Amino acid sequence: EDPQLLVRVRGGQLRGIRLKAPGGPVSAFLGIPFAEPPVGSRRFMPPEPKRPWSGVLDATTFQNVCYQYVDTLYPGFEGTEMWNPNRELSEDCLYLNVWTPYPRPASPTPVLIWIYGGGFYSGAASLDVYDGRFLAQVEGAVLVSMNYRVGTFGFLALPGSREAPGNVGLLDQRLALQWVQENIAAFGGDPMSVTLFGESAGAASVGMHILSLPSRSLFHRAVLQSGTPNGPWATVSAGEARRRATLLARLVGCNDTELIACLRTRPAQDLVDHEWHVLPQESIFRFSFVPVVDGDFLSDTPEALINTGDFQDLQVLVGVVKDEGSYFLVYGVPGFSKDNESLISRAQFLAGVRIGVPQASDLAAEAVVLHYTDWLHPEDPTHLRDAMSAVVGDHNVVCPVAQLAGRLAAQGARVYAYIFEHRASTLTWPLWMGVPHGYEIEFIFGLPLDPSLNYTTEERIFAQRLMKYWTNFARTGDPNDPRDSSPQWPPYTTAAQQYVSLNLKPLEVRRGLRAQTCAFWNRFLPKLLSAT
Amino acid sequence: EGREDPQLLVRVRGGQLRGIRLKAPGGPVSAFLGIPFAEPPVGSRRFMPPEPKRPWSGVLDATTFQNVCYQYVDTLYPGFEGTEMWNPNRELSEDCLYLNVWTPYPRPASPTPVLIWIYGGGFYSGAASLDVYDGRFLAQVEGAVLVSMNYRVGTFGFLALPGSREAPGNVGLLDQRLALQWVQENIAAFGGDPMSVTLFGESAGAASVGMHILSLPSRSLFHRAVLQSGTPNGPWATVSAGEARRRATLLARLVGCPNDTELIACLRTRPAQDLVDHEWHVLPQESIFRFSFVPVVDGDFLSDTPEALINTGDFQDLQVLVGVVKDEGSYFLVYGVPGFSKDNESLISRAQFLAGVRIGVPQASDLAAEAVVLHYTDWLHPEDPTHLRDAMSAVVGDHNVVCPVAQLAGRLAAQGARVYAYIFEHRASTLTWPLWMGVPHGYEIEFIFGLPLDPSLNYTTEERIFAQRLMKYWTNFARTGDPNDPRDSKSPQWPPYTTAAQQYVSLNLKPLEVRRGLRAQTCAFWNRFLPKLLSAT
């Protein structure tokens, strides 16, 4: 009984496991319950804090993955399996994980709280890419990650009702954050220095905690990797939530109270069976059950809230990868496969755009097509294919990010922006996809530091750099190594618009994040649509 | 006859002419100046199509330039060469239908290719007698036969009551066409080859050349065409019949002329100067690069809109050279955009930019102007006054000239024309416009005509050599439909412009450089996108 692996938290005793990191041991406490299981009558309901337990709770293994859609489009393929659940699915899934340095840190250590992505329809804190051991060992970080409910279980709302108010998955996250405040000192964590980081939907969640007052007291700094609370996919209105919820109810044989009670009687997989049949049109980068502008968790729309908010005492790190949009094209755009090179033609490109910008009117779609065509090579298939990627990436990620970065900087935040440009040597997606959404995570988490994984030795040094930026940022609100002297990463501002490229070369400062094209998405396109 | 120069007496269909032996730098040239080609369009003939000049008796003296057609005279900048060089240099008079011929001296032994110049001036001004149109250098140096004509401008040339008998519209175009007919009939008397006639023109002259390409009865009158900084398509070169009716009756109101017959008859009783004095008061919006009386789409001279006709025309037989200057927009900014001046750097504010855009794109709805502003803003430095100044020039240039030219080049190419394309990029060392104006509209002309060949003009040596190069491109093109020198490959080649490759060349002091895409991204905005934002308003 190693006394380093024994911690008493507020609800009783836990026993972690000593894990091996390439350069030393780490203490890991996996599968800590932070809420009562949201099962039976508790489905769709806000999480309640977990009741006290007797004896020593075994926290040496990952708990169950929250009930979710599982991707079986390319069975056997590493590019997809790596995001699939690696534990039993269950509605009983509200658990978190803590990695700390071994021995337990001497003085209060900055805490990093990871929030996974998965479109609010999937994900798990237990995936290997979110392994907190490297960061804990190399940098002495206390690293926390939680499961939160996804899909219908986490985000089905009948806005206004009591039994399905929506945003409960965000409430799960908030509760794990509260848990950290109350308990992280026991692990040698500093509750007074909590940095949230997250990618894609995890990024939008982080943004939502930024924009929700009861969350603000639970962290001090935020990292948003390839996603934002603003933009076309992260939220829905009360009205559209209600509509999708009632349509799912209909699709499974089901007054709010009565409808919600009927929904509660359905096996989990039944809900997951019809999850993808409620979307208003054929689309990509669009998701059925996402946080809802409810006037409660989100007091107004993200756009409204970032325009008017005060961000004086907040540091934020935001960024994107070189090819935010490639991944998605294979999931429903005629002409795209991971298996060839997807050299499309013009007609496929125009049709691709009605799918990539599903809300787009004829005119809007046209404006997009005309903006993204290379008029010197109108019909070149390579350009058209790259363009389709760019449309999807820009509209959904890069431009929402530039907008977010801009508003936060204007309204008092310290902001650092990046573009991630290194394609992992081990990638199993084709070359034409470049650096797809999600492929920076393994680097930030420090996975190349594991000799067993066959990353190049340049990649291993790259990973060490990123871990340093992130944890420097967690420590100080500033990602720069203070010392050494590596040009400096300057803050993003609305005047200079400086951001850095993250790749094998040293930091390069660039100005303007797709500045002309995001002016198109962020300023012009809205005007075009608000004429029906 | 008896004692005078045997080389200077020529007969044409209307009678006998005496010309003048003129000095060019490299030796003498023949000039026949102020040959009448129509009955003076005066009195009851105002607004009416021209009639051929009745034959005369005796020897007509053709030794001096004749009257300039009645027109508005720019007085914004007294003594200023930048404006003066374009001003009428002969008496203003409605009696102005005259043309000019320059030939080698002595006259060519065998039929020589003919270049016909059509001057610009927005259809409200111009003159074939300006110093920049001096045909002597092209005649002396390239052995060209050069012809230029006066045609009626402003109301006299373009005021229309479409449908009517007495003011059918497009008569300035008809003046031009009559001079084309005169050349077919009479040019061989000067050693010119009626079977090898190239039209060249700049700005409204270019638009004019374009209308002739698009109008059947003009087709038989020439073989090849050069369009410099102007197209018949685009937002300023034509008006709808309805709009010309509007502008013409409004002008009539302004001068106290309150059916068509009775109105036109009243207009005919008005002094020419009254018409000119009210000419600018009829435009639907505050604007630049818009002129009150211009060619009308009459379903006659122009059987449909130039856009319609270029989109669906067969241009099998057509060789066309087309291009633009580097800064088509700069000139206009100082006329009617607040913030701009010839006398300072014109560093404007964002607000003066948004206002500028409303004036320069006067047909734009609010959404359209937003699009323009959105497209032309540099989002890294959106308040930078130098960028905004240059974007304002670019908006005006792109919208009125560069993109119309790209549109013209592409449509003509896609439909069988051999098209050569250029951007002229050298600023005259003698230019008196400020440096920020770059290479303004009109400032290639003096080069193509070979003025730098005149030692007294103060051009640099490089400019003298550059002019010779340009004169060679132009006259090779007139001779053969190809600007390239056949016996020469030490120099780089000028490829045809095609829809596939979109090649054009830079004209500056440096050897030819081939570039691809004529503002291809931006012109896709003006040519493909913007029309649709005017459809669904």
Ligand SMILES: *[C@@H]1O[C@H](CO)[C@@H](O)[C@H](O)[C@H]1NC(C)=O
């Ligand atoms: C050019 O230079 C001469 C002599 O150097 C000067 O006196 C004259 O005024 C100038 N003439 C022109 C045409 O610019």
Ligand SMILES: [Cl-]
């Ligand atoms: Cl250019």
